[PDB]
Amino acid sequence: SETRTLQKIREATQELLKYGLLEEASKPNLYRIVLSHPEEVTRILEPLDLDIGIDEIRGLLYVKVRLDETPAQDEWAHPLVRRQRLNLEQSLLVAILRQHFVAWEQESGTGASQAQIAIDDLLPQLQIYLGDPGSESKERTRLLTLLDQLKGHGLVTSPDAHERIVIRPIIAHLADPINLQALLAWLREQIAQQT
Amino acid sequence: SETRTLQKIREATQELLKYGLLEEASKPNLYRIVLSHPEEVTRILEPLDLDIGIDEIRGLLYVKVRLDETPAQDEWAHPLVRRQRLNLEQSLLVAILRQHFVAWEQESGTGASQAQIAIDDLLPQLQIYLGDPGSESKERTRLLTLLDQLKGHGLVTSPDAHERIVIRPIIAHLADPINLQALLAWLREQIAQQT
Amino acid sequence: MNQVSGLAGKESFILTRIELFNWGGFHGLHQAAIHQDGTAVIGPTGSGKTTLVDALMTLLCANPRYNLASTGGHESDRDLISYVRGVSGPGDGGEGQSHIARPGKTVTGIAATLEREGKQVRLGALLWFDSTSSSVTDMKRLWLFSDNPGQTLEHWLNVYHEGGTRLLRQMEKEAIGLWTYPNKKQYLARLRDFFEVGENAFTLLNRAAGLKQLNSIDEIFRELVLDDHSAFDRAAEVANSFDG
Amino acid sequence: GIPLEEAIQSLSSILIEHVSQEQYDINQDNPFLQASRELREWIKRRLIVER
Amino acid sequence: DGVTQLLSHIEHEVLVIEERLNELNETMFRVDFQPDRYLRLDTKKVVHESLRTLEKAQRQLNAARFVDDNGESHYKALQVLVAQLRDACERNRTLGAKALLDPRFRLEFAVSVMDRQSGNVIESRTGSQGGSGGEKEIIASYVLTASLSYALCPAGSRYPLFGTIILDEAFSRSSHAVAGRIIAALREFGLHAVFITPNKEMRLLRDHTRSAIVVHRRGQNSNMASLSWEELERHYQRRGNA
Amino acid sequence: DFRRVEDSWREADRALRQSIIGEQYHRGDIVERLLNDQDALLNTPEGRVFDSFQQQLRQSSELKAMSERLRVILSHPSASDALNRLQRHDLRWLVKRLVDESQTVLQARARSERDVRGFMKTGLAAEHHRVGHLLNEFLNLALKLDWQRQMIRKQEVPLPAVGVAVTGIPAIERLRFKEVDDEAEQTLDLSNHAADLTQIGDDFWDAFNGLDREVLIQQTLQLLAKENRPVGLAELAELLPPAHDLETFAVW
Numbered sequence A, B: 001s002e003t004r005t006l007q008k009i010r011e012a013t014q015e016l017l018k019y020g021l022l023e024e025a026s027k028p029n030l031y032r033i034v035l036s037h038p039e040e041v042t043r044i045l046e047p048l049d050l051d052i053g054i055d056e057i058r059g060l061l062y063v064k065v066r067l068d069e070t071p072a073q074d075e076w077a078h079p080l081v082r083r084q085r086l087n088l089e090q091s092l093l094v095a096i097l098r099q100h101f102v103a104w105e106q107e108s109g110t111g112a113s114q115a116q117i118a119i120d121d122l123l124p125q126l127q128i129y130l131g132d133p134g135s136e137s138k139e140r141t142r143l144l145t146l147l148d149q150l151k152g153h154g155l156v157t158s159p160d161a162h163e164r165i166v167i168r169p170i171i172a173h174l175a176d177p178i179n180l181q182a183l184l185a186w187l188r189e190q191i192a193q194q195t
Numbered sequence C: 001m002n003q004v005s006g007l008a009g010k011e012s013f014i015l016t017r018i019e020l021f022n023w024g025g026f027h028g029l030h031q032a033a034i035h036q037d038g039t040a041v042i043g044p045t046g047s048g049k050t051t052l053v054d055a056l057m058t059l060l061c062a063n064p065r066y067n068l069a070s071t072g073g074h075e076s077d078r079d080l081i082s083y084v085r086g087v088s089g090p091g092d093g094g095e096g097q098s099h100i101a102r103p104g105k106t107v108t109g110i111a112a113t114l115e116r117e118g119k120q121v122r123l124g125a126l127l128w129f130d131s132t133s134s135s136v137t138d139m140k141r142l143w144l145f146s147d148n149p150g151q152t153l154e155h156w157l158n159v160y161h162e163g164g165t166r167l168l169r170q171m172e173k174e175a176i177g178l179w180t181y182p183n184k185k186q187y188l189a190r191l192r193d194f195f196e197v198g199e200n201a202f203t204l205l206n207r208a209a210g211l212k213q214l215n216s217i218d219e220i221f222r223e224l225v226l227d228d229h230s231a232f233d234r235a236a237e238v239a240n241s242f243d244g
Numbered sequence D: 001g002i003p004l005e006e007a008i009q010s011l012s013s014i015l016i017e018h019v020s021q022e023q024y025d026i027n028q029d030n031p032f033l034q035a036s037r038e039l040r041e042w043i044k045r046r047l048i049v050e051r
Numbered sequence E: 001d002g003v004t005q006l007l008s009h010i011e012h013e014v015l016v017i018e019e020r021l022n023e024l025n026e027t028m029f030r031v032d033f034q035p036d037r038y039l040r041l042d043t044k045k046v047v048h049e050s051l052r053t054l055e056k057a058q059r060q061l062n063a064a065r066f067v068d069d070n071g072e073s074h075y076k077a078l079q080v081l082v083a084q085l086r087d088a089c090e091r092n093r094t095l096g097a098k099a100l101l102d103p104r105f106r107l108e109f110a111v112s113v114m115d116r117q118s119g120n121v122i123e124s125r126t127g128s129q130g131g132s133g134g135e136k137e138i139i140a141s142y143v144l145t146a147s148l149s150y151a152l153c154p155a156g157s158r159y160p161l162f163g164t165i166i167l168d169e170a171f172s173r174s175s176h177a178v179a180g181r182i183i184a185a186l187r188e189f190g191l192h193a194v195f196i197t198p199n200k201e202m203r204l205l206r207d208h209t210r211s212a213i214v215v216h217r218r219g220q221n222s223n224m225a226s227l228s229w230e231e232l233e234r235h236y237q238r239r240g241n242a
Numbered sequence F: 001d002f003r004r005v006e007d008s009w010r011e012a013d014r015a016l017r018q019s020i021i022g023e024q025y026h027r028g029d030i031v032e033r034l035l036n037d038q039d040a041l042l043n044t045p046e047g048r049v050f051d052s053f054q055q056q057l058r059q060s061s062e063l064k065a066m067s068e069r070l071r072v073i074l075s076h077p078s079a080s081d082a083l084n085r086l087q088r089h090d091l092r093w094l095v096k097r098l099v100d101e102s103q104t105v106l107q108a109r110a111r112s113e114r115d116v117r118g119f120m121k122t123g124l125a126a127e128h129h130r131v132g133h134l135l136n137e138f139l140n141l142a143l144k145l146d147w148q149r150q151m152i153r154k155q156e157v158p159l160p161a162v163g164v165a166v167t168g169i170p171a172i173e174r175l176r177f178k179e180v181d182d183e184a185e186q187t188l189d190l191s192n193h194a195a196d197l198t199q200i201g202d203d204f205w206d207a208f209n210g211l212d213r214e215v216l217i218q219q220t221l222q223l224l225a226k227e228n229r230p231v232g233l234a235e236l237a238e239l240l241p242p243a244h245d246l247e248t249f250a251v252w
């Protein structure tokens, strides 16, 4: 005699917490379940100071920190969500991928599918700002390591047999893309000053 | 403006989830909040398939997997459960540490004592089972690796400046009589199958 | 020729990376990769080749002899403080009182990675100053031993910048495969245990970087191998006791 | 009750003061640790009680 | 509790040094110095006058310990011994004082190149400096490599566990043909090597290493680039066209 | 006997704990001793002698009389000849240190009694006994396994998951990116100038390329094999164009 939460809802919530996101492409059942009962999931996440951000255009759900009033606390802290600041190279790569994803969305309409990109298409972009590591092999190694690090954060996938990687929809929401734009502008201005 | 779980309760639950266990000897305030409203904390953790195990005698709350009736057992298969099932060498070290903990608890006063043991004390007990690797350095390295794994499980702390570790009270709930009985039955079955 | 090249890194731990941060003339974060078939460090005299050897030896030894290659025979000019502060004693021309590159509060990190059959072991050291003081007792040291690939000098520096020694200790508590020692004696003991070699091995490794000033076999033996272990101080105590 | 750390420090200083003697097998590598170890040897030997 | 203990400790240190050399001879036995020769070591003992005076004084002290005069003759003998000790201590780097109070100065040293099959000594440098700048360098480098290999090897093992060693401008007095032999010997001992070379010898190490860390200063900022020799050659080609 | 009394009390506390733990009817010999407010640690040997000693010491009048007489005796000139400074001081302050030691021992006894009373509560003696018995059985049984096989050592056991920590949620907002500042400028400069050898010295490049006598060795050998005739140095130079002049000639 109890009030156990629906098994499917519990599974969806645990999956969402474990992965922080739910893609209709990967887990259609859990995504549909969460869509069917959004109030239940938001109530479940309320005690943990968390919430779900629906995005039906891209078929993506994600966990957003539903903090308290926290007046203008730019340094908000959450016990369960650990904040990370990316590197200079990692931030540059993220900005490049984000702008490419935005361009793909524009050219295929909002909510497109599988915004892909090619490693050879990214190497020159990285070389423009970061410079030349000293060889083609070193350039490829650097790009591959950066892509691996980004995949660890869940922003891109591993290259396929065609040396292509798909930008994941989670790039659409990155808290403060304005910082990414400012970094890109600063990098391009520095390069122009060099030349 | 809407039903908001009391910020004390939310903070206590978040700390408990972040650290897994909540001890009165270190955070008496949050421990007391959790103890005061155990039903609220249990309701909050229910959707996660997590439950709160209490030890008022030791002043220790912890989070354990909540299995409804028969979730295929495999409680270590819980999506939110990181770490891996303890292996045989880790179980043997846990048994040795639990024996030390029981010895300390027998001769324990009334205040906080934080049961401690020198690393050099465990070396012969382990060497009896794992054998002599050839030199003191090898066995010390083996013991340090095992202790690091156990600390990852939260049963100990890293050796301090005096080469002494602290056995956390959580061990008294890992190697308790019921779990020890289950492990003994499993080990007897393994021995019988081996021969 | 190449068949023998595969022996290295199989039965032994071979150095395969060095990372520096605000060490000597290496401002910022620098990384150097070392090949498994031997590597050569080359460059015009007066760059950071001796700086690199000294970083590695600082990670390895207890009282490393800095710049032993050129200062062998007499006392070394450089020290740990001058490497952390980035003093430029030698190169002058506009020297602003030794041109201390990092005079204020600063943090310098050094890290060396060793590998064997895919097993990794990282030694590290964070040395920081909180003020303008340059006293040896005013430098805060934190040595690090790791076997987890995810524990890189970059991660340690990020944690330090974010939350000082408090967050460093907290990270050590929740980290798998990390051991932080505030005193170098324990860290060197851990190194001794891991590599199953006494302090004399690493002291000899240090002395090997100053082999240039060599002479007849007698001097090579009495100055390179079989470390001092002299009894010139015990004699003074014996003499004082006999005075009593 | 003498605090443990102070006793360890005193024993370490005494141990360093007599490192030359061969009888004592005092190791100069890390006297403090040895001192602590020695004290613990006499705590489980029941010469002294730790509390 | 003193003097006698100090002398016994010095003698024990000498014995330890001798045993270390003896068991390093076996580690050198496994590698050919010349193509089939192999090299061994001989300790021998110093014959300084200070050591013989110390022996005389110690004999006098032993004889005096048996006299029944309330420790007067014993005190006089101990006084002579301590006077000798203070004499050595004050002049702490005269050869006599070093031989008296330094374990690694009471015994000489010598190398001997032999034959792999014929155990007869073929060339014994019994101190006998008589060598060119390249010869002394060869012997010193070989002995240092052998010592490093022995020291880094865990007890009871012939393969060092810490296989990386660092050399700093090691070879300067030897020809390019004999340095390669040194590198070959270093590899034979199982030691991975990081050499630090001046602008010279960049061609010598190109035959024994597969990568280089180029360290270049751009003012007060040193930078390092880890490149294979081929990539360095491509950089040079770019230079020649720039 | 001040330390002997404390040793006896410690042993008595240990014995009482052991009796409570090893007894099969905990309920009786727990309440029989807890409701009571007696010593519960009445060490029949010295420890009752200490009680009489405390009774005598707490008696007033005699203590101050003896202290005054002791100081009067210390004042005597012959006292300096009899004892020394340390002994004289110790004897003079004998009563003060006696009372201090009595207070310390009484505090230790009260603390030990309170500790044993606290242990008697919480009813963990039965659990301690059962856990010790089970641990002994498990440790004796584990001797039959083969611990030299990684397969055995890495077997997963059925122990439960206690202390499950839910930390590290991705929470895509958790990510922040580098912001323009001096550190970013320095990082960009390091990235650009690493592997930028243009400014490097010319002599470095000149020393980089040199006469690799290894290749020249084989080239000369092949040339002589092709000619298979006695060749002079001038003829060799003509046939083989030396790119380093005397450097080649010495080799030849």
Ligand SMILES: Nc1ncnc2c1ncn2[C@@H]1O[C@H](COP(=O)(O)OP(=O)(O)O)[C@@H](O)[C@H]1O
Residues within 6 Å of the ligand: C023, C024, C025, C044, C045, C046, C047, C048, C049, C050, C051, C052, C070, C078, C079, C082, C083, C084, C086, C087, C088, C089, C090, C091
């Ligand atoms: N700790 C330090 N103290 C003084 N000068 C330093 C230090 N670290 C770097 N430098 C400067 O950087 C250069 C170090 O050159 P380096 O290549 O390490 O020496 P070497 O040519 O002997 O190998 C010099 O110009 C020196 O002034």
